[PDB]
Scaffold this active site. Structure first.
Site, short mmCIF file in Angstrom:
data_model
loop_
_atom_site.label_atom_id
_atom_site.label_comp_id
_atom_site.label_asym_id
_atom_site.label_seq_id
_atom_site.Cartn_x
_atom_site.Cartn_y
_atom_site.Cartn_z
N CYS A 141 -12.44 5.77 -72.10
CA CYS A 141 -12.20 5.48 -73.50
C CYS A 141 -11.60 4.09 -73.67
O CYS A 141 -10.65 3.73 -72.97
CB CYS A 141 -11.28 6.53 -74.12
SG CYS A 141 -10.83 6.20 -75.84
N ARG A 198 -10.99 6.86 -67.75
CA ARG A 198 -9.96 7.24 -68.72
C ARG A 198 -10.29 8.57 -69.38
O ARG A 198 -9.39 9.39 -69.62
CB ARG A 198 -9.81 6.14 -69.77
CG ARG A 198 -9.43 4.78 -69.21
CD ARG A 198 -7.96 4.72 -68.81
NE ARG A 198 -7.07 4.69 -69.96
CZ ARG A 198 -6.93 3.66 -70.79
NH1 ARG A 198 -7.63 2.54 -70.62
NH2 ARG A 198 -6.08 3.75 -71.81
N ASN A 234 -11.66 1.44 -82.21
CA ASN A 234 -10.76 2.27 -81.42
C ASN A 234 -9.82 3.03 -82.35
O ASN A 234 -9.47 2.54 -83.43
CB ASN A 234 -9.93 1.43 -80.44
CG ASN A 234 -10.72 0.99 -79.23
OD1 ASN A 234 -10.74 -0.20 -78.89
ND2 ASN A 234 -11.36 1.94 -78.55
N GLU A 259 15.64 19.44 -76.36
CA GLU A 259 15.47 18.03 -76.06
C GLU A 259 16.76 17.37 -75.56
O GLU A 259 16.69 16.25 -75.04
CB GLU A 259 14.96 17.29 -77.29
CG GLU A 259 15.94 17.23 -78.45
CD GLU A 259 15.34 16.62 -79.70
OE1 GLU A 259 14.11 16.74 -79.89
OE2 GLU A 259 16.09 16.01 -80.49
N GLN A 315 7.54 19.97 -84.35
CA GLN A 315 8.14 21.27 -84.56
C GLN A 315 7.77 21.77 -85.95
O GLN A 315 7.25 21.03 -86.79
CB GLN A 315 9.66 21.23 -84.38
CG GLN A 315 10.35 20.03 -85.00
CD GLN A 315 11.85 20.06 -84.81
OE1 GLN A 315 12.41 19.29 -84.04
NE2 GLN A 315 12.52 20.97 -85.52
N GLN A 354 18.78 12.40 -86.34
CA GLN A 354 19.95 11.53 -86.36
C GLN A 354 21.17 12.35 -85.96
O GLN A 354 21.43 13.41 -86.53
CB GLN A 354 20.15 10.91 -87.75
CG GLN A 354 21.30 9.92 -87.83
CD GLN A 354 21.42 9.29 -89.21
OE1 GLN A 354 20.66 9.62 -90.12
NE2 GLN A 354 22.37 8.38 -89.36
N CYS A 364 24.53 35.15 -85.53
CA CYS A 364 24.21 34.30 -86.66
C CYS A 364 23.94 35.14 -87.90
O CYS A 364 23.32 36.21 -87.82
CB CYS A 364 22.99 33.43 -86.34
SG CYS A 364 22.43 32.41 -87.72
N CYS A 385 23.82 24.83 -90.19
CA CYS A 385 23.86 24.23 -88.86
C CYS A 385 24.05 22.72 -88.94
O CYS A 385 24.81 22.14 -88.16
CB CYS A 385 22.58 24.57 -88.10
SG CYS A 385 22.27 26.33 -87.91
N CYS A 442 29.73 26.15 -88.31
CA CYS A 442 29.32 27.55 -88.22
C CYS A 442 30.56 28.45 -88.18
O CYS A 442 31.41 28.27 -87.29
CB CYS A 442 28.47 27.78 -86.98
SG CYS A 442 28.02 29.50 -86.70
#
Ligand code: FAD
Ligand code: FMN
Ligand code: SF4
Ligand code: SF4
Ligand code: F3S
Lengths: 348, 1483
Positions: B1, B31, B229, B876, B924, B933, B1092, B1098, B1103
């Site tokens: 590609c 590729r 492309n 993460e 997500q 942030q 919870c 949150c 909490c």
């Protein structure tokens, strides 16, 4: 970033000292001052999905304010310091704040999110403070609904349910009439609940407000032998049967025939009527100043009987009950979504 | 590609260039991935100049005229012959009537047997047609115009007839070969290419990826002129605008041929074909190829301060008449005698090209495409963004972009035109009047306001200067299913970009955004002069009351204003037709601005849904070809959310005037709340709404409001197909749904109730983002919550069954609640079905951010799932390596699913190797097209240490994956991760969306083992509220579409689908399994089990139960226990098994995909609007296999690592002894070292080996992602030039890159690295002997680097380490840099000041002796390892160098370092000092 729930500790208003509580037949508590009310209102954390408003039967016991008070909203308004808006929001849903605040046992306090291992927010006291300040400032005035269509409903029974239904129908625009046996309207609020809890001046003021609205109460009408059901139906389209529940179960045990054994409801009604008539100088009530007093049957009725006997200055008082003494904290089979069963130690 | 071209500048021709181009294509082949079989060609083709020599030698029966006086055509025909000869006769007739003489016809010989099965079956016939030139056609430009006319007429006739044929190309200087061929197959198939008679000047090429497995010969490019492309994200609004201007194009060059060429674009064509058609029309219209390319793909002209005045005026003028075409793209067009090459306004693709002593430019995607002599290479440059690589064959020189751009700009007096012709609408300051209606409550209830909405969306905007945040993403039922009346806006869900394009950022990349809006009527595009720009221009789409009144009161004859009452009484069709009549009457009169006003609305007239009205007006105007003459301003009360605003702009509204919101603010200010002044409040609200609109744009990737305006980026969920076609044409809808009559009934009901309202003077409380008794139903009501908690804590089954019943029945919550079992089958005993232990192995906990959760909660989740035997997950935020060893008690806190998010916070050799499976968080459920942030206040030291950042520094996670610019890059990253952990399974996380089937097929081709489809109902730690409510679609549609597309393509037996999002019951699990799920993810439910209470706080970090708060005081209140989670999972498994007994299914794979057992429940029919849905799309089972059997064969074998490096290095790694080797590496070898790094990390761990234990040498061009995940102790001497993503995820070791040995020019001035380098690395060194690419050191977090110049956006999101740039620097340097240092060398201090972004950086001059010594030592090592002349000269002139150096450091980083240093000097322990400094900084 509200942090009151951990940066503040729950308090209580200024109550008259117990040793002088037994002399004057007046309210035994007062609402919060401005700063104290703001601090207490700050505790509620803008709770999402509040558990103080579910208002439904859970495990055989109520939990949350059944009339769906906008508790987070007017708690936030109380904290912010705008009081007329809070009163408006409260009156949006509730119609008898002056009775609910100073009578209701506050299941909302028992069951909410913040009650997890910590003292709950004083919803009842905040509501009482809001309504009392509103009445003192005189913002509450009769609505006088302009629209009216000729109709007729004849609510029967002057209890809280009857009064609420009459107010709602009058706001709708249908003429109503309240048939009551007792001299004064109110039902339990007048005679059953003691003067201690509900000074009858507030009840009378609210009934006068309803009369100004135009409920047009009629007194001394047992709507039984006096007035027949067929004639009532012919003269009135509908009938809201708020007839009440005043029949009390009796103990089918031998020995309950001798004079002296009395019914709690009859005794309380006699005492309250005597006080309202001539400061219990008529001598047409039941006296126990120099005699022992025993009350059988625990609960609010037993507490009221004990308080009335104490104010009558009985030599000794003992309260009896079959249910084992409640524990001092939450147990395994009791949880915060359900109304707790902890030791209370209320007035009297 | 990719693309490629091998052009000889001076114009000399030979067959060698064509052969080298074919070799380049063959090398580029690697590729791409694998489809059904490796032989199939996903699409490739080659372009050349006309081979007159070969034609004259071979045809032998055409009297070919001179070079420029004839054209050659290429046509694809079906296998049949009757239609073939009919079309041949018809084309001859077209040519004859147009007057040109047909020379003849020819058939191209072809080798069919050299092709795969599918392409052999679809093999079309080829014939080349020769066109003549008449004496009248003096100019080849006119000749090309006539040829284009002929081609367009033939295409029109063909589409009218309905036949299937295509013109590959018809031009006098370009002939194109293409098809479903691999490059090794193209030469064999087109036997013409093998002849030694071809002589060409240049040879463009291209290889496609074919996201879907069902391409056609026509779609594959090179197109007629240009090679393309990437993808274009504005291809619906693009087509709408182009069709609108179609009816109004007028010029003299084409004469009356516009009538013939009325269809200028192919509606069914793909993005590349559409772009080619539009570009060809524009250039034939009489514009230069470079000029039209600049017009179509402009640079960032707004918000950029590095542009010349002439250029700024040029782009301001052209943006006023033609919108920009945003998206990742690398254009390389041709016109026979001129060539060009461009990148998009953001430069999201690589382009590195060579130059030699023989004038052989080699422009391609990667570097090592062909073998070149290092003694002959002259320039190794990169096509930087906003730079025109232009070539002119006749002149034989590389004409400089600066002069081309300057002379294009100066060709006309654009500056004077802009200065003079602009219209000023300065409002009167004495005409102020704070408007009030006296019916505020009535209007608010009519438009659907709520006290919750006010107090939770309007006041917070003013208070915080931004849209308010949230958590626990929406779980309320869709608007179509909700019984309560809902406005039309809720039916429309936003969209975003998952693959083939990144979600671009806004705040940090502000220089690329453009919010300029033009109001009025556009002029003659083909011959524009001053009336295209005699228009009003705005800075923000939103308007204030004064501004709106000024626009309405403007009485200029050219800019008129009309007011149209958008209201109806009974018939919506009558209302819309009447509105169209007013519109067309006003256009005939000559207006240019239309005002759709909902005012003057009473009990008898109700308002049309503003979105529907605007869409209908826009579609009617586009169809009638008058949209360009008007400007639709909208004034609707129901406009208070960024979602509503973005919907209105996307579907046509020119500006919004939230008069109702302004009146509400006036009322609140009068009452006393919101003490800020009215004007300031209005300005702040406007700014916040514009910021939100920019955020919504950035989610998708469209960086221009003008482009988004036409673009229709919404997906109706519950609108009938007929209604969509009528009014919202181009919008995607799956289930059809409600109709116009139902919408009208809903609107009338709402209006009647609101205007009745005869009981109270208050607004009913809202229930969109919180639960209030009697309000809108929510999935997690208190009844369900406490029933679930009680059942889980008691281990009782009856309570859990009651909870399941309450959660499922009594309401309509989701689509899956509309499915019911037939009930007539063979039940089987509970002891005959698969067991609960087998059940529980197919569950997951979902990603759980360590920052969002507490340590106790995270460890409880991990322990519970590991004990149960499922697969836990790590968020993460990385993970402390201390959790990789089981405790003495037997607990195992290790997470089986390691997530690789955009942040790449904890990515390390150890962190990756010690795992079982790997996910790639493409998005997500809650915040797909947005990052995150974590300010200093919320980032505690015990989180910063884990995440590898300084305590108390605001971390930023970029929205997109900077290593993911297309599906090819996704495949490359998948291969990289598989090489890093050969003994793991790769996973990807998608979100349900239109085209998700195509994306899933592309991912499966990219060889991702597991695909996860997450609905928008999933939760999140923090995200904007509108992104919570109106993003994504329910996972049911996504899963159904993905399963159908995969199993139709034939790849469903090569991947393992999954599901998550409000999976609260075994009924939901069974629904997912029937829809085609294999493993499930439970995240929200385990939190409820742990304690919870769904409080939705949150983001506040407060909490009360201590489940999602880092505060120790709250953490002390935690009460969870893994036993509760185990009980929950066991109960789910047992209930599922009971339903298995009910349904009579014996095994998982046996049941899976058996959707025939599903039928709609009678409750859906009973529902007053849900009965109008079409469920056949989900209830449909094409033939095929429906279970994962094949192993998803990767290509780990045959890699240079395993072949050569490891076999001689096992002894070294196992004995801890030094070893040295030398290897020859070509571009095909991709990673080259990650395998050895993984082996070292697995054997030893984080400590690694002593410095310089393994010294690998390399030579020649390197592959993509070279030396990724290298641990400490390794050293990769790369004596050459590399490709993108060098040192990806570095975790120690050295990387030395030096130019080739035969290259003697300024290697320090010639680029030697790709776009992105050291993305997400944590610690290490580096010494690059040359310029770097765009976005250098994107997420450096401890790696010290030395480079001689960098591209644009360099050092974007650093959080540590240091950088030492020995040269110039691109614009927007240190954009969002929240940590680290950058000792950037420079001479022109003020120019450096201007180039740098001043938001969050403080500059200094070197004064610290330790800093000076560190820089000196780094330069000493640099010279010792590289022999760089620049470094040597700097060492020699150290005295001047120390003065000329410039230091950059963020404010927070500097303050934190100073405070911690002060505490350490005072003499406090490290932990206590860090805590004290953090408390002082974030008091
Ligand atoms: C904190 C607290 C304390 C409480 N303490 C007590 C207590 O001490 N004692 C107690 O009994 N309850 C007590 N209650 C219960 C409460 O008073 C009652 O449940 C409720 O107020 C009665 O509602 P109602 O509308 O039926 O009023 P009611 O008063 O029951 O309404 C009936 C009315 O109609 C009259 N009436 C009776 N028969 C007829 C008829 N045939 N036709 C027409 N009218 C008729 C009655 O005299 C009365 O005025 C307490 C509750 C709370 C929360
Ligand atoms: C508090 C919370 C935080 C989450 N954090 C992330 C995250 O950081 N990354 C991610 O990809 N998904 C995250 N999710 C989503 C889940 O990991 C999972 O993908 C899915 O949405 C859960 O669906 P469920 O609500 O049915 O449990 C989070 C969910 C919640 C409730
Ligand atoms: S105290 Fe007031 S708010 Fe609480 S339950 Fe009683 S009536 Fe409702
Ligand atoms: S009383 Fe409890 S549930 Fe109600 S708002 Fe306050 S914290 Fe929330
Ligand atoms: S919603 Fe969040 S704030 Fe706590 S109570 Fe639940 S983890």
């Amino acid at each position: 970033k509200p942090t009151g729930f951990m940066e503040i500790k729950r308090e209580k208003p200024a109550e008259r000292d117990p040793l002088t509580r037994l002399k004057d037949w007046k309210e035994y508590s007062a609402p919060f001052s401005e700063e104290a009310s703001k601090r207490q209102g700050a505790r509620c954390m803008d709770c999402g999905t509040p558990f103080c408003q579910i208002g439904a039967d859970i495990n055989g016991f109520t939990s949350g304010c059944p009339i769906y008070n906008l508790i987070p909203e007017w708690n936030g308004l109380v904290y912010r310091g705008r009081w007329k808006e809070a009163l408006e929001r409260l009156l949006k849903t509730n119609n008898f704040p002056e009775f609910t605040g100073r009578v209701c046992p506050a299941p909302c306090e028992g069951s909410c999110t913040l009650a997890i291992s910590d003292p709950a927010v004083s919803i009842k006291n905040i509501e009482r403070t809001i309504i009392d300040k509103g009445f003192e400032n005189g913002w509450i005035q009769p609505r006088i609904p302009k629209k009216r269509t000729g109709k007729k409903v004849a609510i029967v029974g002057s209890g809280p349910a009857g009064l609420a239904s009459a107010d709602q129908l009058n706001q709708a625009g249908h003429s109503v009439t309240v048939f009551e046996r007792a001299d004064r309207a109110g039902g339990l609020l007048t005679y059953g609940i003691p003067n201690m809890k509900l000074e009858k001046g507030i009840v009378e003021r609210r009934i006068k407000l309803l009369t100004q609205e135009g409920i047009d109460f009629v007194t001394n009408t047992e709507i039984g032998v006096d007035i027949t059901a067929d004639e009532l139906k012919e003269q009135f389209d509908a009938v809201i049967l708020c007839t009440g529940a005043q029949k009390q179960r009796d103990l089918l045990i031998e020995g309950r025939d001798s004079k002296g054994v009395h019914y709690a409801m009859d005794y309380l009604t006699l005492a309250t009527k005597s006080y309202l008539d001539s400061n219990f100088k008529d001598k047409q009530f039941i006296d126990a100043k120099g005699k022992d007093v025993i009350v059988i049957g625990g609960g609010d009725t037993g507490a009221d009987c004990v308080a009335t006997a104490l104010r009558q200055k009985a030599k000794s008082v003992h309260q009896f009950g079959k249910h084992p003494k409640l524990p001092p904290a939450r147990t395994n089979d009791n949880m915060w979504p359900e109304q707790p069963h902890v030791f209370t130690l209320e007035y009297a | 590609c990719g693309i490629g071209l091998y052009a000889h500048l001076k114009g000399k021709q030979t067959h060698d260039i064509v052969k080298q181009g074919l070799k380049m294509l063959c090398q580029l082949d690697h590729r791409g991935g694998q489809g059904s079989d490796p032989d199939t060609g996903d699409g490739a083709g080659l372009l050349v100049q006309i081979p007159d020599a070969f034609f004259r030698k071979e045809c032998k029966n055409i009297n070919l005229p001179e070079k420029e006086r004839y054209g050659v055509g290429m046509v694809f025909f079906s296998q049949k012959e009757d239609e073939r000869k009919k079309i041949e006769k018809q084309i001859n007739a077209l040519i004859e009537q147009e007057g040109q003489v047909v020379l003849g016809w020819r058939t191209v010989p072809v080798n069919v047997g050299k092709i795969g099965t599918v392409a052999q079956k679809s093999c079309p016939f080829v014939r080349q047609v020769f066109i003549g030139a008449s004496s009248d056609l003096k100019d080849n430009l006119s000749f090309e115009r006539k040829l284009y006319v002929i081609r367009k007429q033939a295409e029109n006739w063909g589409v009218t007839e309905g036949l299937d044929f295509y013109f590959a190309s018809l031009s006098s200087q370009t002939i194109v070969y293409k098809g479903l061929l691999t490059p090794e197959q193209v030469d064999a198939f087109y036997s013409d290419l093998q002849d030694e008679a071809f002589v060409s000047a240049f040879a463009l090429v291209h290889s496609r990826f074919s996201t879907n497995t069902f391409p056609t010969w026509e779609r594959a490019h090179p197109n007629r002129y240009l090679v393309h492309n990437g993808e274009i994200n504005t291809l619906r609004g693009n087509i709408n605008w182009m069709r609108a201007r179609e009816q109004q194009f007028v010029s003299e060059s084409f004469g009356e041929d516009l009538n013939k060429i009325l269809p200028i674009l192919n509606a069914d064509g793909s993005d590349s074909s559409i772009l080619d058609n539009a570009f060809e029309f524009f250039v034939m219209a009489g514009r230069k190829p470079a000029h039209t390319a600049m017009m179509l793909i402009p640079e960032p002209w707004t918000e950029n301060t590095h542009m010349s005045k002439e250029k700024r005026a040029f782009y301001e003028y052209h943006s006023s008449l033609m919108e920009p075409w945003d998206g990742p793209t690398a254009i390389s067009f041709t016109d026979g005698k001129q060539i060009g090459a461009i990148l998009d306004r953001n430069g999201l693709r690589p382009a590195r090209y060579y130059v030699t002593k023989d004038d052989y430019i080699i422009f391609s995607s990667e570097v090592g495409v062909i073998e070149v002599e290092q003694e002959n290479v002259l320039y190794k440059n990169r096509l930087e963004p906003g730079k025109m690589l232009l070539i002119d064959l006749e002149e034989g020189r590389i004409i400089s972009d600066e002069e081309v751009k300057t002379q294009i700009a100066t060709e006309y007096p654009y500056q004077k035109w802009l200065e003079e012709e602009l219209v000023q609408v300065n409002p009167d300051p004495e005409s102020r009047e704070e408007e009030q209606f006296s019916d505020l409550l009535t209007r608010q209830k009519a438009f659907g306001y709520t006290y919750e909405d006010i107090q939770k969306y309007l006041i917070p905007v003013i208070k915080e200067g931004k849209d308010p945040l949230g958590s626990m993403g929406n779980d309320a039922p869709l608007a179509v299913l909700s019984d309560r009346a809902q406005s039309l806006f809720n039916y429309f869900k936003q969209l975003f970009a998952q693959v083939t394009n990144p979600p671009i950022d806004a705040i940090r990349e502000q220089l690329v955004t453009s919010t300029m809006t033009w109001l009025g009527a556009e002029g003659d595009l083909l011959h524009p002069s001053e009336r295209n720009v005699r228009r009003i221009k705005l800075y923000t789409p939103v308007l204030s009351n004064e501004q709106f009144y000024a626009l309405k009161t403007i009485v200029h004859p050219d800019l008129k204003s009309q007011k149209i009452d958008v209201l109806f009484s009974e018939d919506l069709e009558r209302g819309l037709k009447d509105m169209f009549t007013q519109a067309e009457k006003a256009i005939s009169q000559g207006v240019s601005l239309l005002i759709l006003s909902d005012k003057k609305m009473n009990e008898r007239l109700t308002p049309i849904p503003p979105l529907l009205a605007v869409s209908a007006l826009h579609q009617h105007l586009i169809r009638k070809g008058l949209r360009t003459k008007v400007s639709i301003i909208v004034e609707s009360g129901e406009a208070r959310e960024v979602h509503h605003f973005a919907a209105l702009i996307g579907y046509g509204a020119d500006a919004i005037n939230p008069y109702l919101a302004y009146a509400t603010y006036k009322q609140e200010i009068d009452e006393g709340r919101l003490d800020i002044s009215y004007e300031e409040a209005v300005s702040k609200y406007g700014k916040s709404i514009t910021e939100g609109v920019v955020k919504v744009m950035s989610k998708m990737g469209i960086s221009t409001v003008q482009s988004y305006r036409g673009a229709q980026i919404f997906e109706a969920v519950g609108i009938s197909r007929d209604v969509i076609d009528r009014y919202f044409s181009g919008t995607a809808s799956q289930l059809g749904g409600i109709d116009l009559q139902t919408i009208a009934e809903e609107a009338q009901r709402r209006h009647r109730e609101a205007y009745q309202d005869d009981y109270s003077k208050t607004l009913e409380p809202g229930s969109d983002f919180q639960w209030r008794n009697g309000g809108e139903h929510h999935a997690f009501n208190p009844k369900t919550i406490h029933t679930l908690q009680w059942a889980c804590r008691r281990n009782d089954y009856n309570l859990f069954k009651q909870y399941t019943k309450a959660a499922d029945e009594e309401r309509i919550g989701f689509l899956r609640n509309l499915f019911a079992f037939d009930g007539n089958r063979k039940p089987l005993k509970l002891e005959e079905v698969e067991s609960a232990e087998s059940i529980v192995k197919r569950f997951k906990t979902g990603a759980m951010s360590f920052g969002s959760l507490s340590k106790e909660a995270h460890e409880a989740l991990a322990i519970a799932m590991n004990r149960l035997g499922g697969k836990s997950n790590s968020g993460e935020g990385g993970e402390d390596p201390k959790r990789f060893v089981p405790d003495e008690n037997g607990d195992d806190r290790r997470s089986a699913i390691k997530q690789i998010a955009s942040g790449r916070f904890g990515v390390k050799s150890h962190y990756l190797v010690n795992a079982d499976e790997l996910q790639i968080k493409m998005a997500q459920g809650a915040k797909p097209g947005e990052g995150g942030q974590l300010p200093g206040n919320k980032v505690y030291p015990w989180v910063a240490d884990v995440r590898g950042s300084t305590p108390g520094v605001g971390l930023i996670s970029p929205p997109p994956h900077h290593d993911i610019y297309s599906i090819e890059d996704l495949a490359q990253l998948i291969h990289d991760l598989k090489n890093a952990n050969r003994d793991a399974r790769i996973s990807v996380k998608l979100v349900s969306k239109a085209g998700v089937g195509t994306i899933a097929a592309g991912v499966a081709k990219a060889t991702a083992d597991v695909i996860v489809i997450s609905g928008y109902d999933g939760g999140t730690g923090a995200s904007p509220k509108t992104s919570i409510k109106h993003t994504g679609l329910p996972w049911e549609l996504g899963l159904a579409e993905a399963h159908q597309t995969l199993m139709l393509n034939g790849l469903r037996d090569r991947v393992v689908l999954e599901t998550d999002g409000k999976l609260m019951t075994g009924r939901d699990v069974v629904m997912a399994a029937l829809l085609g799920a294999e493993e499930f993810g439970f995240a929200t439910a385990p939190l409820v089990v742990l304690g919870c209470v769904m409080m939705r706080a949150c983001h506040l970090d407060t909490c009360p139960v201590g489940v999602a708060t880092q505060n120790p005081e709250l953490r002390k209140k935690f009460m969870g226990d893994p036993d509760h989670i185990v009980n929950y999972m066991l109960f789910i498994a047992e209930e599922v098994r009971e339903y298995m007994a009910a349904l009579g299914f014996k095994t998982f794979d046996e049941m899976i995909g058996r959707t025939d057992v599903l039928h709609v429940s009678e409750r859906a029919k009973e529902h007053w609007k849900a009965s109008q849905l079409d469920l056949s799309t989900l209830l449909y089972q094409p033939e095929g296999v429906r279970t994962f059997q094949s192993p998803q064969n990767h290509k780990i074998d045959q890699s240079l690592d395993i072949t050569t490096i490891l076999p001689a290095v096992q002894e070294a790694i196992e004995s801890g002894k030094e070893a040295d080797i030398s290897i020859e590496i070509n571009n095909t070898n991709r990673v080259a070292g990650t395998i050895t790094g993984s082996e070292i990390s697995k054997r030893y761990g984080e400590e690694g080996l002593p410095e310089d234990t393994i010294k690998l040498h390399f030579t020649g061009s390197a592959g993509q992602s070279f030396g990724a995940f290298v641990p400490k102790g390794m050293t990769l001497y790369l004596d050459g030039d590399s490709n993108d993503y060098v040192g990806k995820g570095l975790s120690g070791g050295k990387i030395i890159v030096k130019s080739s040995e035969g290259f003697n020019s300024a290697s320090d001035d010639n680029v030697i690295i790709g776009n992105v380098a050291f993305y997400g690395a944590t610690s290490g060194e580096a010494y690059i002997n040359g310029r770097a690419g765009e976005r250098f050191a994107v997420r450096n977090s401890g790696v010290n680097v030395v480079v001689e110049g960098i591209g644009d956006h360099g050092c974007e999101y650093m959080t540590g380490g240091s950088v030492v740039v020995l040269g110039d620097v691109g614009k927007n340097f240190a954009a969002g840099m929240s940590g680290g240092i950058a000792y950037v060398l420079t001479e022109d201090v003020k120019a450096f000041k201007r180039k740098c972004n001043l938001e969050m950086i403080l500059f200094e001059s070197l004064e610290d002796e330790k800093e000076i010594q560190q820089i000196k030592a780094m330069l000493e090592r640099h010279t010792a390892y590289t022999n760089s002349q620049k470094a040597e000269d700097l060492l020699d002139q150290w005295e001047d160098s120390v003065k000329k150096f410039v230091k950059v450091i963020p404010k927070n980083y500097k303050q934190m370092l100073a405070s911690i240093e002060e505490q350490k000097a005072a003499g406090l322990s490290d932990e206590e000092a860090i805590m004290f400094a953090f408390e002082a900084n974030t008091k």
